[PDB]
Assembly symmetry: C3
Homo-oligomer: 210 residues x 3
């Protein structure tokens, strides 16, 4: 439990964590430690020091910066709130290759992966993930803890509800609103508004029931 | 109507203008003023000085560089010709992150957005838009005033007619020719030549009549 | 047959060669010569000196670095082995804009084109092509001589067999394995494992027989 000072604590030790650790390192940040619900190790050289019960200990020793590297949107949002209650600040992990327009408003805890572009006047909620290669055109609104998967793309003026997930290569045409907790499958091309809490798949994307 | 000297005049004050203004600024250019058919303001800090009737006044005061930031392809092409008749030179707006091969031939008035790649020996007509994240592989020919939408991709040796539009995430396989004034819907994957003036949608893209 | 010393020999003189030559040049490498089965010229200024029968002559004159710029996967793999038997080392051609994570394992003879991202702990076999704009998320395994076409994307933990080909804009969801010698058509979205030697097309991708 002997750590260096000044680095970032990561919640989560999975594949998403690996990519986040490397984004932070590419920016010259140090990653201090991981907390993982499997408390057994290291992820890309970063020690796993315990489960979330280790958070108070980490804060006590002076570490105060944290990122939640958990892909699950509702779990990520809960763990973000837990981290803030424990006195951590949620950093953003923005790969140096990402292009984020100067008029974009970013929340906290946001992952913006390599190859991303986000254009003018888009707003990105806390704990959003904008994954590898994704594109966000002008005037989009991304709600807290939503996830745009790798190689997905939003055309202009799209709104994505809290905790919504767009799978790899999903596309949304201009002006469309997607509700909270909605899942667009890989490749789905969304051509009309989607309400909350549905799954939509296909070209064009259609809602799938039971 | 008091402007600085030396900057670029933009025709159009919408979302496409915002992204173009930011591309020009990212290259260290200054944007002088906007002319918009709604002559009422500012777009990202750039004053709207009037409608197109203000063009002669702008030229008289020494401004001579212009970009047409209008997404509509036929309107953009008409306004490009109007600007040149009024003594403006059409600049290109190429985001610093775009990768444009040294053997690509670029026209004038061309937008090439963040994250774009254009590979060897492609030719890009005047007033084309190559939007955010789009890919153009080797030996493509893009006609004047066509538009490749965000995250679209052309494989090698594709020809795109004048004023044709490919929606977000559209894909075209090698060797395909797309006629002038043709629209490929978002996500459409074009696997055979398309004639002029049709709409094609789907995977694979199929022509849609009335 | 008078060449400079120190440059890279390219097998293949087609469109893929053009893009590879430009990637090598963008890194400050010199391309010495091309060998092409049509021995008649130059490709982007690089002389075509003969067919593969010229390889021994090139090695004798001190050239020892080679890239196989042939899109055909089985032919590329055969010509890679021929080049190594003739005493050449297979270089990699990685465009300066590509983002290749520090924990990625690269083979030899690999093309990684402009705009590519490859994330943590992916392994890339000899003679793979990762084409323009393609994305490879964490923990992927790309077999020797496979080809990810332009704008294609693999989500995390995907395995792609030897000589498999994914067409422009193909997508594969997490955890999927694709067999050797399998072809995914342009735009195909692969949602379950594919065996060896099939063709799969569509959203979702389905195997097509005769
Ligand atoms: C849509 C998705 C959520 C469905 O999961 P699921 O509901 O367990 O679906 P199943 O695998 O049982 O498949 C149900 C049917 O829909 C089809 N299907 C599955 N995913 C599909 C997709 N993305 N597009 C179109 N059809 C799809 C399947 O072929 C199956 O068809 P059948 O009825 O003919 O068998 C999932 O396949 C998906 O696309 N996930 C995206 C994951 C991702 O991109 N992660 C990146 C994270 S960084
Ligand atoms: C194809 C498109 C042009 C159609 O507009 P439209 O003709 O007004 O079409 P509608 O919205 O009336 O839909 C007609 C039908 O085609 C379907 N459809 C619409 N767009 C589709 C698309 N991209 N792919 C497949 N099907 C589509 C709709 O589901 C509707 O189906 P229905 O008959 O079952 O209701 C439009 O949806 C589109 O894709 N635009 C791309 C815009 C864009 O990408 N802009 C980026 C600018 S930077
Ligand atoms: C799938 C592919 C390999 C098929 O080639 P093919 O077997 O000669 O197929 P055909 O052109 O005869 O078309 C067969 C049918 O499948 C359809 N089809 C072709 N390609 C398709 C694709 N990518 N997705 C869905 N359907 C497709 C055609 O519409 C045709 O339909 P029909 O039965 O209604 O006429 C090819 O179209 C393709 O996608 N190539 C990708 C090439 C590429 O991306 N190169 C980039 C290199 S860097
Ligand atoms: C965006 C990515 O999201 C997901 O990747 P991921 O890293 O979130 O998923 P996994 O690789 O399963 O890793 C999840 C990790 O998250 C840990 N975890 C799960 N729940 C908790 C928790 O409550 N607290 C802490 N501290 N850690 C938790 C797990 O023990 C596991 O190590 C997947 O859906 C991937 O497909 C995708 N690349
Ligand atoms: C590529 C983009 O194309 C389109 O964006 P856009 O900026 O062209 O569209 P809008 O946001 O409607 O803005 C168009 C602007 O263009 C102005 N305009 C429309 N016609 C004229 C004109 O004739 N002259 C001048 N000077 N301006 C004109 C309008 O008053 C309006 O302000 C949309 O299709 C978007 O989806 C897309 N991002
Ligand atoms: C990734 C790319 O793959 C393919 O492009 P490509 O450059 O491999 O294909 P082509 O433009 O036909 O060029 C193939 C070249 O490869 C040469 N070639 C073909 N066979 C041989 C060979 O055995 N030895 C040598 N030294 N050269 C060979 C041909 O004479 C021809 O000049 C296409 O499928 C494209 O769509 C794609 N951009
Ligand atoms: Cl570190
Ligand atoms: Cl300015
Ligand atoms: Cl050279
Ligand atoms: Na990209």
């Amino acid at each position: 439990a002997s750590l260096a000072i000044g680095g970032v604590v990561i919640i989560g030790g999975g594949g998403h964590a690996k990519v986040v650790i490397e984004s932070l390192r590419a920016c010259g940040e140090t990653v201090a430690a991981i907390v993982d619900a499997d408390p057994t190790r290291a992820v890309l050289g970063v020690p796993v020091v315990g489960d979330d019960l280790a958070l108070p200990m980490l804060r006590e020793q002076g570490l105060s910066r944290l990122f939640v590297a958990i892909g699950d949107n509702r779990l990520r949002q809960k763990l973000g709130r837990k981290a803030r209650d424990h006195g951590f600040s949620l950093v953003n992990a923005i790969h140096p290759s990402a292009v984020v327009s100067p008029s974009v408003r970013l929340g906290e805890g946001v992952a913006v992966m390599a190859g991303v572009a986000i254009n003018a006047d888009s707003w990105i909620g806390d704990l959003a993930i904008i994954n590898t290669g994704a594109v966000v055109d002008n005037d989009c609104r991304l709600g807290a803890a939503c996830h745009l998967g790798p190689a997905s793309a939003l055309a202009g003026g799209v709104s994505v509800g809290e905790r919504a997930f767009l799978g790899v290569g999903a596309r949304v045409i201009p002006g469309v609103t997607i509700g909270a907790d909605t899942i667009v499958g890989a490749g789905g091309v969304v051509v009309r508004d989607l309400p909350d809490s549905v799954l939509a798949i296909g070209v064009p994307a259609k809602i799938k029931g039971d």
